[PDB]
From Swiss-Prot, chains A, B:
Homodimer. Residues 25-44 bind DNA. Disruption phenotype: Cells lacking this gene leads to ETH hypersentivity. It comes from Mycobacterium tuberculosis (strain ATCC 25618 / H37Rv). Binding of inhibitors to EthR induces a conformational change in this repressor, which is then unable to bind its DNA operator, consequently allowing for increased transcription of EthA and bioactivation of ethionamide (ETH). This is HTH-type transcriptional regulator EthR. Inhibited by tert-butyl 4-(3-thiophen-2-yl-1,2,4-oxadiazol-5-yl) piperidine-1-carboxylate (RF1) and 1-(thiophen-2-ylacetyl)-4-(3-thiophen-2-yl-1,2,4-oxadiazol-5-yl)piperidine (RF3). GO terms for cellular component: cytosol. The record marks N155, N158 as: Inhibitor-binding. Residues 2-62 form the HTH tetR-type domain. GO terms for molecular function: DNA-binding transcription factor activity; transcription cis-regulatory region binding.
Amino acid sequence: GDDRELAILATAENLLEDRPLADISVDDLAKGAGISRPTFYFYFPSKEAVLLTLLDRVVNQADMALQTLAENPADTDRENMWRTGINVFFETFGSHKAVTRAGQAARATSVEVAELWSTFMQKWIAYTAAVIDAERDRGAAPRTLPAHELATALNLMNERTLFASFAGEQPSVPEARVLDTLVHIWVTSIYGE
Amino acid sequence: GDDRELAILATAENLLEDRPLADISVDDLAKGAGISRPTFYFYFPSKEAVLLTLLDRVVNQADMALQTLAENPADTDRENMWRTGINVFFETFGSHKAVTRAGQAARATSVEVAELWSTFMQKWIAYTAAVIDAERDRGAAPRTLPAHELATALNLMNERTLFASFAGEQPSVPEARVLDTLVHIWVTSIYGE
Ligand SMILES: CC(=O)Nc1ccc2c(c1)CCCC2=O
Ligand SMILES: CC(=O)Nc1ccc2c(c1)CCCC2=O
């Protein structure tokens, strides 16, 4: 039942390793999931809906892990706290690079994909701003830029910079260096005067 | 002669204000430039080649202005020097938002567009790294991250953050706030310990 649906999802993520979504057919997903093309359409209206589902699970996985961190503050310094949070996105999306890559491409053509990314980026930025505000209230960070504007730029930096690393774009920061790179920029811009 | 070519270019940039490149036809460019469809093909092989030319001029305009700044150091403080340089990209691309928007979309489908962006981003990052290195040599900046890796992340931040502002994406930094936002993050991460 839902086992056929997981098969479609797994086939799509596996196939997106080798070719873009345009080079994947609904017949390709059916064959890989051991079903017919009509049966596929019972589970998903299109191949784009398959990718939307895959991206939704990856994004919610990252959101939920961030939630877990929030409820369980790690006993460590401020730089490592920021590192642990940025690392949620590094590990979650870096463990699903094919879905991440195809998800960013689909933003240009899928209203749902664009709304999904926008909704969660708005959420993660608001949470970033609230932490920055808490730190300022504590006297731990100076009151420089508006916290929400600072948080917006730092989150967009991570989105673009992580994506470039995962895809091996030129230019990009090497994937083994990108976490330390982003943490440095977050910590200096949040706490610096 | 070249006056027909400028007409095609102007028509394309004007039309890209209202619709994506997919909704612009070669007939649309011909009509707007006062020529026939066969005559258009004498000047450009495709509508994508028209956008490539438009993006090439905008990118070279920004590159040349940055060159001008380099040769003519502004007598001012370090923060304003960085501001003046980031402002090249703010003003150049912000004065050609339609071409900027369509140019970023075409990266996903045009090898030439992708190579063009990559070549100039590599150039601007190397120049950023060389300035960071000079400042460290002078004792004006601490030796924290590898300069080229830091420069890579800060340039990708500006690319993504400026684009989001120009397009009015949600989320984005308001366009009237984005210059101060990026300068703060550049200056704190370059000079901060
Ligand atoms: C895209 C991205 O990396 N976002 C991000 C990273 C880290 C953190 C937050 C958001 C919320 C505040 C706490 C935190 O550590
Ligand atoms: C995308 C972008 O904003 N790049 C950028 C901005 C500013 C500067 C440089 C590159 C080169 C070093 C000098 C400088 O001021």
